[PDB]
Amino acid sequence: SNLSSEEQARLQMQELQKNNIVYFGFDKYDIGSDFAQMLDAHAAFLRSNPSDKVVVEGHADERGTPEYNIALGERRASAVKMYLQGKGVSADQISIVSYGKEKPAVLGHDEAAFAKNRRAVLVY
Template identity: 55%
Template sequence: MEFKKYSKTLFFGATLAILAGCGGNAATQDQEEGAAGTDTEVQPVITSDGSSSDSAITGEQMGQDVENLEEKAEEVVAAMPEIETIYFDFDTSSIRADSREVLDMHVAYLRVNSDAKVVLEGHADERGTREYNMALGLRRANAVKSYFQVQGVNSDQLEVVSYGEEKAAVMGHNNAAWSKNRRVEIQY
């Protein structure tokens, strides 16, 4: 009795499995593969309403940072910072906490060398539409610009340009490439 029940389940299960395996066509299989590929992707969830991006840094933090910088500036003086690129999360222009250190080095340099000019080049990854990414790249560059400005860099030293997804730093269609392409390049 028990065995019969078991075999019946097995039997129908096998029927379904085989039919399902055979019934599909190339198109759906492709889609499944595509979907499987993106399942592994970890996308940052955007919870803020987007307004925080430009003003993500609060006044208090800035005050502290400025003080710290005063001290740091003594040490770095004329050394041009080596790291010139900071990275962003998908579809956001908020400056990540781990980018602050790099930006602060640039702020220190720019404040000491007030004749130095810098172009902030905003970029996006290939996903999404080109013009939206163009705007997103601009917002990222603008976010860096505001950060510099509130830290006391003269706005005459700063120029902003966006290339959207047109100038990828890394070729490729995976998370590793995308994360390297969502960036702002600080070019002297």
């Protein structure tokens, strides 16, 4: 049906709240085609709401040392930022934080834990 432009933003945010994670390859920090549509929806939202900022989380797997794992975390959030920047989102609206391997989603040493910890999360 046709909605009020108010709960239209509500439903919109819900989609942005739900699907804010870009998953990465092992040691790979390039954005896949799957999240393009996803990020293109984040971008359109952000530059329509100039006074709203997103923070991108950077995450690496257990392998490596915690301090150097920061490096892999930042470049993954940088690709996300750059993609949104290409779509027109201002640097003003974005800041990135890399945690390295400090905040896992899953625990263990199975690849299942690894693959889902190799992520880039967008928090509003």
